[PDB]
Design a protein around this nucleic acid. Structure first.
Lengths: 134, 134
DNA sequence: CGCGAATTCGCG
DNA sequence: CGCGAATTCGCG
């Protein structure tokens, strides 16, 4: 607002929602793929992007980066700030993996500090988030 | 739609919300007070109107009435149909009374049948619900 | 299509 | 003012 080009953009990829979910973190300016999560059979868009932002936080923290993270998801950003992923997705055998990851990402947020700013990507003005799965 | 005048209208009365709540059931056409609940120190508008509709159901069922009930509350009507009062109000010592009543009204709905239609009062067209506490 | 936040609605 | 449903929003 305007744009920190030297940043990490995190994206979620969803077929049906709920359904197969994956995510990745990319360099905002170049589009270089910095990390990617192999598809999880059942999750939601919001769960996936929550995990993406937390994966981003961890990736930047261990590399001592001052870089911010951009997400186009009001929801995932709010969940990260709250340290709580308020998903409606049922907890059952089929959803146990995503919920395990989510519960662990929440635990990470509850037990760590980070300086990374988490910024909203303004799709209407800046086009789509870098490397959007679309 | 239009109006069954021979009916029971149930109303909730609220100061602050949450705060002191009361309710009553009145004859729609005349305004005669058919039952009234003395003020409960802490509740919400929606909890109070839920209890009002269930009190109405019980009052009509035991008098073998075919009369419908009108409520202006989308929320309380939906909760009665679902047999579940989805209130956000915290459960603590101060709210224990209203929550006790609500939990018991839910149990009543889970263990009884009734033929009473529960109809939406159209305030925009028919003016305010009969004897509105306003 | 669905997921959830934000916003709008009707109410006392 | 707050309570919650319904609706609108942005997203993949």
């Amino acid at each position: 607002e305007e744009i920190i080009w030297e940043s990490l953009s995190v994206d979620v990829g969803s077929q049906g929602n709920p359904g197969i979910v994956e995510y990745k973190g990319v360099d905002t300016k170049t589009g270089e793929v910095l990390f990617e999560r192999e598809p999880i059979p059942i999750g939601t868009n919001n769960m996936g992007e929550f995990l993406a932002i937390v994966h981003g936080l961890r990736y930047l923290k261990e590399r001592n980066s001052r870089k911010p993270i951009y997400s186009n998801s009001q929801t995932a950003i709010k969940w990260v700030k709250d340290k709580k992923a308020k998903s409606t997705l049922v907890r059952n055998e089929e959803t146990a993996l995503i919920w395990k990851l989510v519960d662990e990402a929440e635990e990470w947020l509850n037990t760590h500090t980070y300086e990374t700013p988490i910024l909203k990507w303004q799709t209407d003005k800046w086009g789509e988030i870098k490397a959007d799965y679309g």
